Write a protein that binds this ligand. Structure first.
Ligand SMILES: [Mg+2]
Length: 248
């Protein structure tokens, strides 16, 4: 399911450019706009529920304050996360979108690993990908699920040398890396790094801050053929760009 000819487009926290991030509304809209799937962030509540929130706290996206790890689900459901949307549980999300929609669950909380794995098992795990910046979260997830597709998010240069070992340890499908690499080490070195990871047998998932580096200098086009998935805030804009390049 993650291995396919057509480049995969995921809405970052749903169609977050046009709808409130990490909401059922945003998720539905992304898929309704033609995205292959969604990406989202999860944490474990004080009562053992898996909830969708990017930040460690609800302050930025909600009308309320607090750390979700320190709240119950019921407390959490008080909040307004945009346009009357409530913070969803992971199960709520699977219910909301098609059964074959791709879902990249980003584990923000190692404590959530076991629950996430159980829910995933019940919800067409073949279309699921687990990723994290936190290697320990990934290691914990592997205690409970050794089959589901896994990606390593990277934003530190020093992590890169570790990739071969991590791949073997975690059985990674992909590394999930930022367009920010280009201004950082230059396009050519970025191309070389991508070749390196591919030489390991890894696939590649691309992301950036607020979609800006995908389009600047036509950076994304330069990477043609070296990536299998893109995570984008503006789903439609990304789909249009890919069509223009003959990739959609
Ligand atoms: Mg995320």
């Amino acid at each position: 399911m993650w291995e396919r000819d057509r480049v995969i487009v995921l809405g970052h926290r749903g169609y977050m450019s046009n709808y409130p991030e990490n909401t059922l509304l945003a998720f539905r809209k992304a898929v309704e706009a033609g995205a292959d799937g969604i990406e989202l962030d999860v944490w474990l509540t004080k009562d053992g529920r898996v909830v969708v929130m990017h930040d460690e706290t609800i302050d930025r996206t909600s009308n309320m304050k607090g750390r979700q790890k320190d709240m119950t689900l019921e407390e959490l459901k008080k909040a307004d996360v945009g346009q009357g949307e409530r913070i969803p549980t992971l199960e709520e999300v699977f219910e909301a979108i098609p059964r074959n929609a791709l879902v990249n669950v980003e584990l923000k909380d190692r404590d959530a690993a076991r629950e996430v794995a159980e829910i995933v098992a019940e919800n067409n795990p073949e279309r699921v990908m687990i990723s994290s910046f936190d290697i320990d979260a990934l290691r914990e997830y592997r205690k409970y699920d050794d089959e589901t597709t896994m990606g390593l998010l990277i934003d530190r240069e020093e992590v890169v040398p570790l990739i071969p070992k991590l791949k073997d340890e975690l059985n990674l499908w992909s590394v999930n890396v930022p367009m920010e690499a280009i201004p950082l080490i230059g396009l050519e070195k970025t191309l070389q790094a991508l070749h390196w990871v591919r030489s390991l047998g890894l696939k590649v998932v691309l992301w950036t801050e607020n979609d800006v580096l995908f389009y600047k200098d036509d950076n994304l086009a330069k990477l043609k053929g070296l990536f299998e998935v893109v995570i984008a805030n503006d789903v439609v804009r990304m789909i249009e760009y890919l069509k223009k390049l003959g990739l959609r």
